[PDB]
Structure formats: C-alpha cells, structure tokens
C-alpha cells in the first residue's frame, strides 16, 4: 500500500 503523491 502506498500513499497518493498528492498527499503532501
């Protein structure tokens, strides 16, 4: 599971 690149 990986975060969204837009989750800054």
């Amino acid at each position: 599971d990986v975060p969204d690149y837009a989750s800054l």
Partner: antibody, heavy 120, light 114 residues
Framework: EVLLVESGGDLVKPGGFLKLSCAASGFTFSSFGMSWVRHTPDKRLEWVATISNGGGYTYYQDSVKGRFTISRDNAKNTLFLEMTSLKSEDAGLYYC?????????????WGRGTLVTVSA | DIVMTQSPSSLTVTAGEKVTMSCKSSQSLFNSGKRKNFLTWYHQKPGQPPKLLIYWASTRESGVPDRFSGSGSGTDFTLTITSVQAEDLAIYYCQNDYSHPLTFGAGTKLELKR
C-alpha cells in the same frame, strides 16, 4: 486495454443512500490507486474521494468527508463508493478514474459515468 | 485549497488560428520531488469523459496531437493550440494534481466564429 465501468447511479431521495461500483479490466487493479471524480450539472468537475492501491489511505473531498466511503475489493477488481445522507448538491455523473501510481500524471483512465440524481 | 482560475470562459475561434488560454493557481504546483509542476490539462466533449492532454504543465500525452502545447510555471500556466481545428472544440480544464484536494478550474469553452 484498461476499462472502467460504473454502476449504481439512480434517483435517490435526499438524506438516503446509494452505493456505486466501478469495474476494472485490463490492468493489475491491485497496483493502482483509484478516485471518484464527479461531473456536476453546472458542468464543473469535482474530485470526490481517492483510495490507495491497498486500501489503507482514503482521501475525501471535504464536502463528502463523513458521508461517503470509498472501498475497493482487489480480489474482484471493483472499487466502490457507499454514499449516505445525500444532499441535492451531490447529484451528477460519477466517474471512477485510475490514479497514475507510476507516472504521476493526472487522470489518464476514465470510466463512462453513472448518474446520481437527488430529489424528493 | 488551491484555487484554479481559467480565463476566459469562452473563446470564439476559427480553424487554423493560434489560441491561448490561461490557468492560474493560488499556490505553486511545483512538486520538488519530481521537479515537475503538477498541473494537468484536460478537455471533454459532450457525453464523453475528460481526455488528458498535457500533464506536468508541458508534457504531451501520447496520442494527443502535435498542436497542443502547455507551458508556464509556479502559478501561471497556459495552453496553446497553434492551428485550432474543428475537432478541438470542447471545454478545456486544468487541474491541480499536486496536493489534496484535487481542484479543477471552471473550464474554458471553445466555440466557433461565423
């Protein structure tokens, strides 16, 4: 080829609930995050929610937070959005779009749309 | 939120014209990790879903005709169609895809001159 096919839109009375589905062919569903983007009657586009590729990070548009819930079932290649306490301002055509995990380029794969109408 | 402003609302065009439309964002969309500005241009034709045209302010998707060009940085981004052709008439939207929430501009609609 990648395919995303929505189901579930219907005419709902405000306050109620509806649950939409989007079905992913032609890619490793499991490797990619997914979002629901909404197309309002006023033609505007609205991001509604994102789920990461495993299901443990869920991002919500602040007007949706609390009321909607995005799930996916990586086994059945399906993404979901259970929607409760539908305000009239939630009507629209709902699109699931794939989230570009490796290319980080925006929404390149869109579905066809399921239409949610909300009125009493 | 980053608020994306697309001016104008409509553009009246005739084919073979160069057009140019704006997109301003309230915060820079520069993602320091990829070194790219995270702005994506889309257009949508009636009935159909949006179609991605340029991402990272200037990189052209594959299959998107040679005439679409995107450019700008920080807060002012612009899309240019150098020889607009009739099949380019649609609403064009820019999108912040740098940070959540993802925000779309209002749209610039292309219409034809007669």
């Amino acid at each position: 080829e990648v395919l995303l096919v929505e189901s579930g839109g219907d005419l709902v009375k405000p306050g109620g609930f509806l649950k939409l589905s989007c079905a992913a062919s032609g890619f490793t569903f499991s490797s990619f995050g997914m979002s629901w983007v909404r197309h309002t009657p006023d033609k505007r586009l609205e991001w509604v929610a994102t789920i990461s590729n495993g299901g443990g990070y869920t991002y919500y548009q602040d007007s949706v937070k609390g009321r909607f819930t995005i799930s996916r079932d990586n086994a059945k290649n399906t993404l979901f959005l259970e929607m409760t306490s539908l305000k009239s301002e939630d009507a629209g055509l709902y699109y699931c779009a794939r989230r570009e995990r490796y290319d980080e380029k925006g929404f390149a794969y869109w579905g066809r749309g399921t239409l949610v109408t909300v009125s009493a | 939120d980053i608020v994306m402003t697309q001016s104008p609302s409509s553009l009246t065009v005739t084919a073979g014209e160069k057009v140019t439309m704006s997109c301003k964002s309230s915060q820079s969309l520069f993602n320091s990790g990829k070194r790219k500005n995270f702005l994506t241009w889309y257009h949508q034709k009636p009935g159909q879903p949006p179609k991605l045209l340029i991402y990272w302010a200037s990189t052209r998707e594959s299959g998107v005709p040679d005439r679409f060009s995107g450019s700008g940085s920080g807060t002012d981004f612009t899309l240019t169609i150098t020889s607009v052709q009739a099949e380019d008439l649609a609403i064009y939207y820019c999108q912040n895809d740098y940070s959540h929430p993802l925000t779309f501009g209002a749209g610039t609609k292309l219409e034809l001159k007669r």
